[PDB]
């Protein structure tokens, strides 16, 4: 039992249709891929503003920041599940993760303030632990794992969120994931610009991976119709 059967997933030796034929030797072509993990470690722009017709344009990536009406108002926010999430399911990381059924590891997030060289402000990037819900106000966000980011001194702030793992089987689409954390941005201070300088400025986000990342049980991609 178990012989004279064709199993798609088997590794046997096959008789060569064309023997006695010298294959061309290999050459040195730059950039040889050894593992898929290396691809998942390149920072990719994240469409945070995928709201309405924003996706069918170029403004989906840029995050709008306005000095007016932002004493303590939230700037942005999204759950922390790469694959299966509108904001991260289409990046390089998310596209590699949509092939495996089980993945665990750490995620790196980089924010780059793209404004004048004369604009100064502060932001309050907060990380909610998996079970805990997204913060209601700026105080709730401060009483946690925050990072006060000053854009006058540093033009780019980097995070390294851990405890990131598969939250569901197959494919699900849901806002506010129960077993996933939330990253939110709050206006600690307003954008202070001199005369003859635009006060409306934009931010951008880049998602990457880390050395401690695992991916098992490869499956089919759900983006093919």
């Amino acid at each position: 039992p178990g012989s004279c059967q064709f199993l798609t997933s088997d590794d046997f030796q096959s008789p060569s249709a064309m023997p006695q034929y010298d294959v061309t030797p290999e050459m040195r072509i730059p950039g040889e891929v050894k593992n898929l993990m290396e691809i998942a470690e390149v920072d990719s722009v994240v469409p945070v503003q995928n709201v309405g017709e924003k996706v069918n344009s170029m403004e989906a990536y840029q995050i709008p920041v306005r000095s007016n009406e932002g004493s303590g108002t939230q700037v942005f926010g999204f759950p922390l599940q790469p694959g299966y999430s509108s904001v991260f399911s289409r990046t390089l990381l998310g596209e590699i993760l949509n092939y495996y059924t089980h993945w665990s590891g750490s995620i790196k997030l980089t924010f780059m303030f793209c404004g004048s060289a004369m604009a100064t402000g502060k932001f309050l990037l907060a990380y909610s632990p998996p079970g805990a819900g997204a913060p209601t106000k700026r105080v709730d966000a401060m009483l946690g794992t925050h990072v006060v980011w000053d854009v006058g001194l540093q033009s780019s702030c980097v995070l390294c969120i851990p405890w990131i793992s598969q939250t569901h089987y197959r494919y699900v689409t849901s806002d506010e994931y129960t077993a996933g954390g939330f990253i939110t941005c709050w206006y600690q201070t307003n954008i202070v610009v001199p005369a003859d300088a635009q006060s409306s400025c934009y931010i951008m986000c880049f998602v990457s991976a880390c050395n401690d990342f695992s991916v098992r049980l490869l499956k089919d991609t759900p983006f093919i119709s």
Binding site: R138, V139, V148, D150, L153
Partner: protein, 245 residues
């Protein structure tokens, strides 16, 4: 280039040169009566508590935040004050202010110990509501507070509410902020009190005053305010032991 200082969960951005001002040449170290008076230290309490920003405008007298009272409602420090009774703590103010090169002004950041305020009416003392402001800064005043049958704290900016010359407040640990040179101020305050441990709800150890000596000036078109931002970190705080010898 900037820097990052991670205390516990919190992380804050500061300049490579910070010119820290240690209070009286003393770093806020721990306490150096056996079973009769057991003491237990708390560590996680230490972290960066960022208070609400205040908008500094042309017509702005000043502000004042009581260091024990300000954190009485935020995180572990707010909680510990309700649970334990006696406690001694040290502080690390981080007054930061961001404005362009086309703004001009000057601020005095001073940590005053035992800042006993005066009262509009000489006969009575100020009410705790007009004296203590929680989760919000208290502002000074340009003109004198009208005296009457009230408990309004005297809040004129020049007398400072303590009835002294505001030009002599420099005697206390302080730091100036010239909008054309300095952009921040760091002051480390040791624990200053007659007793080793004191009740934190009945006595304010230190008072933080930020008064602009030179008015903010800008040309029409620039942002019409400057968001001063204050960060407080409790240092070497210990509380009484609730155990049984």
């Amino acid at each position: 280039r900037a820097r990052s200082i991670t205390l516990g969960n919190s992380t804050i951005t500061t300049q490579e040169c910070a010119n820290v001002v240690v209070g009286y040449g003393v770093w806020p170290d721990y306490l150096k009566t056996a079973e009769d008076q057991p003491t237990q230290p708390d560590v996680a309490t230490c972290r960066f508590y960022t208070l609400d920003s205040v908008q500094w405008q042309k017509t702005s007298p000043g502000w004042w935040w009581k260091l024990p009272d300000a954190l009485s409602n935020l995180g572990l420090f707010g909680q510990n004050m309700q649970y334990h009774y006696l406690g001694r703590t040290g502080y690390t103010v981080h007054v930061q202010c961001n404005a362009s090169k086309f703004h001009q002004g000057c601020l005095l950041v001073v940590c005053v110990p035992e800042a006993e305020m005066g009262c509009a009416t000489l006969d009575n003392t100020p009410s705790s509501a007009e004296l203590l402001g929680g989760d919000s800064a208290k502002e000074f005043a340009d003109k004198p507070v009208a005296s009457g049958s009230n408990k309004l704290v005297q809040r004129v900016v020049y007398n400072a509410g303590m009835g002294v010359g505001v030009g002599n407040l420099t005697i206390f640990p302080h730091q100036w902020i010239n909008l054309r040179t300095n952009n921040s101020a760091t002051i480390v305050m040791p624990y200053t009190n007659s007793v080793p441990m004191d009740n934190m709800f009945r006595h304010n150890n230190v008072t933080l005053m930020v008064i602009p000596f030179v008015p903010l000036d800008y040309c029409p078109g620039s942002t019409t305010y400057v968001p001063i931002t204050v960060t407080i970190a409790p240092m070497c705080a210990e509380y009484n032991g609730l155990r049984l010898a």
